[PDB]
Amino acid sequence: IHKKTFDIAWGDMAALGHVNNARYFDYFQEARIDWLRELDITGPVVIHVACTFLKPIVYPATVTIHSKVNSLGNSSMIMDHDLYQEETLMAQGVSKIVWINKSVPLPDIIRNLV
Template sequence: MPDSPLKDFPVVVSFPLHWGEMDAFGHANNTRTFTWFETARIHYFARIGLTGPSGAGDERTNRDGVGPILKATNAEYLRPILFPTRLVAGCRATRIGTSSFTLEHAVAGEDDGVLYTRGSCVIVTLRYATHEKVPVPAELRAAIEALEGRSFSS
């Protein structure tokens, strides 16, 4: 996908638009966007070792009980998505802070490269046993930087 708007996203997931994802206005329902963002985000988490592929069991947190929790998310709808089409959802990091990091999301047409939706989210690193936010672990920061192929300043 050299000309794709997602060419700089290290994690890209492909899927079809399902008929049941359409709304009464004849385009993809806006709520589906957040599911697509989530799917790309979970794949991103697996790539950085933040959660296993299943997202279940002890794989949800590191050995210190620290894992991700969604603090905020948003979407900007650029064009309606019409059936039938194949889509790709991408995820990449844009910032690593002290106790959180920001991910950028985008959804585009797999065949035509049309950018349909973009957005972002803030992920907080949380110690689940006490529900307190904690600093982004050094190994997590290193994994994000390795996947992205660049370093981030705090």
């Protein structure tokens, strides 16, 4: 639903030779900001973030983050990021985003991302 291609930086690599896991969260966050900026987004805050590391990534690489929403509970949402190197899936991201200091019903430009 939202796609972002980009290249791994040589300095995103940690000493044992592949992307630091923490940079995966820099990647998912940029992807989230990008998408929200397209949508022209009282605000969200990330309450939770997680990654599952399937395959380690090496320089050089071109990768693509397929972002999608998967549940809206009013005032809350869950958002998935899938990180592909070529057709291979290298990691799964998942963020819980809330709207706000108290809970405001979900914007209506995302209710509509369905």
